[PDB]
């Protein structure tokens, strides 16, 4: 995350770190004590030996001895993710559930029919680089960025027709604050009170962008509302699966 | 702006908005309560219903609702949304559904 700030424990309790052989590769969001929602691109050919992945939760410093680390039983990725950029989403089932505490809590999904509000300012968090040619963050960072319309983002001066219907852009035309390398798979959450209580919902999954924080090259996210049914089905269908599975 | 499907934090009873009246109605208990509890939570953006139960208007109260909605169990398993398989009804037994959906999106710090 470029242009963000250090956050504290308990603020973003659904944020987890996905590590492969020790290194933080992607971010993810807890949907329950045992299911994490992240991006499908985090699992290329070379990183599909589940025994080499760990999920780190409940701490904002990567080297906290107080965070918990659990294994992975299965990864269900979207079979329409042609690289294997639309459909860049996957679910990770932990071998056992995380306890839910004041530091570990799941995030909600958008309600049925709930649409994205262009211009609304949401938060994006992660341990990715704080500068493109920089190092990952040691302490989890948070940044507030607005949703940009597709009419603007697909304009020739931004991503000239590369934003497809199930993804959206968020950022400042001016650049300066954005997600970056190492934030992939992480949460883009917006808060609302439609359930009469303020709750944070996962509206996007950090997917890609050109460079980081450049003006007119905002970050692109997977639009979670468009995959609600894919998520409900995947969890019903594969709760007992082990390995890499694909669902369309 | 309120979502048309709500769950009470006092007793988890489900309430559905009736747009022709501007009132909130209860969901009459049926043999398909588990699927209705599950569908209602999903609808609202929760992941699932952890459990559900049946309340009795005579012991629990109406808590500001006006009537019931009954579910078409025959169309129920073809749906994605609740509002499209529901209809006003009398619900003679006066028993309705409560659903405990998985809590989410709230910080629990002091
Ligand atoms: O995510 C990402 C990767 O992903 C790695 C993770 C380990 C297995 C798969 C492998 C491809 C590699 C290179 C770059 C990125 C990435 N770039 C990026 C840019 C932005 C942005 N500028 N908005 C992001 F928000 C997130 C990423 N990830």
Short mmCIF file of N, CA and C in Angstrom, two decimals, chain A residues 30-31 79 85 111 143 146 162 164 182 190 202-203 211-212 223 232 239:
data_model
loop_
_atom_site.label_atom_id
_atom_site.label_comp_id
_atom_site.label_asym_id
_atom_site.label_seq_id
_atom_site.Cartn_x
_atom_site.Cartn_y
_atom_site.Cartn_z
N UNK A 30 -11.01 -13.11 5.71
CA UNK A 30 -11.73 -14.24 6.37
C UNK A 30 -13.25 -14.07 6.16
N UNK A 31 -13.87 -15.11 5.72
CA UNK A 31 -15.35 -15.12 5.48
C UNK A 31 -15.95 -15.86 6.68
N UNK A 79 -12.73 -21.33 -12.45
CA UNK A 79 -12.31 -21.94 -13.73
C UNK A 79 -12.42 -20.94 -14.92
N UNK A 85 -7.74 -11.33 -17.32
CA UNK A 85 -7.78 -11.12 -15.81
C UNK A 85 -9.15 -11.20 -15.10
N UNK A 111 -24.93 -7.54 0.15
CA UNK A 111 -26.26 -8.21 0.18
C UNK A 111 -26.70 -8.40 -1.28
N UNK A 143 -5.35 2.39 3.71
CA UNK A 143 -5.51 3.60 2.83
C UNK A 143 -7.01 3.69 2.45
N UNK A 146 -11.41 6.25 -3.25
CA UNK A 146 -12.75 6.19 -3.84
C UNK A 146 -12.89 5.27 -5.07
N UNK A 162 -9.62 -1.99 -20.77
CA UNK A 162 -9.14 -3.26 -20.14
C UNK A 162 -10.02 -3.61 -18.90
N UNK A 164 -13.09 -4.93 -17.45
CA UNK A 164 -14.23 -5.78 -17.86
C UNK A 164 -15.31 -5.70 -16.76
N UNK A 182 2.17 -7.23 -3.46
CA UNK A 182 2.14 -7.86 -2.12
C UNK A 182 0.73 -7.66 -1.50
N UNK A 190 -16.01 -1.62 2.33
CA UNK A 190 -16.86 -0.38 2.46
C UNK A 190 -17.82 -0.61 3.63
N UNK A 202 -16.98 -6.73 2.17
CA UNK A 202 -15.90 -6.96 1.18
C UNK A 202 -16.47 -6.67 -0.19
N UNK A 203 -16.18 -5.51 -0.74
CA UNK A 203 -16.71 -5.16 -2.09
C UNK A 203 -15.74 -5.50 -3.21
N UNK A 211 1.98 -0.36 -12.35
CA UNK A 211 2.88 0.38 -11.39
C UNK A 211 2.07 0.50 -10.13
N UNK A 212 2.29 1.48 -9.33
CA UNK A 212 1.49 1.62 -8.11
C UNK A 212 1.49 3.08 -7.88
N UNK A 223 -14.92 -7.56 -8.58
CA UNK A 223 -16.16 -7.05 -7.97
C UNK A 223 -16.79 -8.27 -7.31
N UNK A 232 -21.20 -19.09 -2.52
CA UNK A 232 -22.14 -19.98 -1.77
C UNK A 232 -22.06 -21.43 -2.30
N UNK A 239 -16.73 -28.32 0.70
CA UNK A 239 -16.33 -28.28 2.15
C UNK A 239 -15.41 -29.41 2.63
#
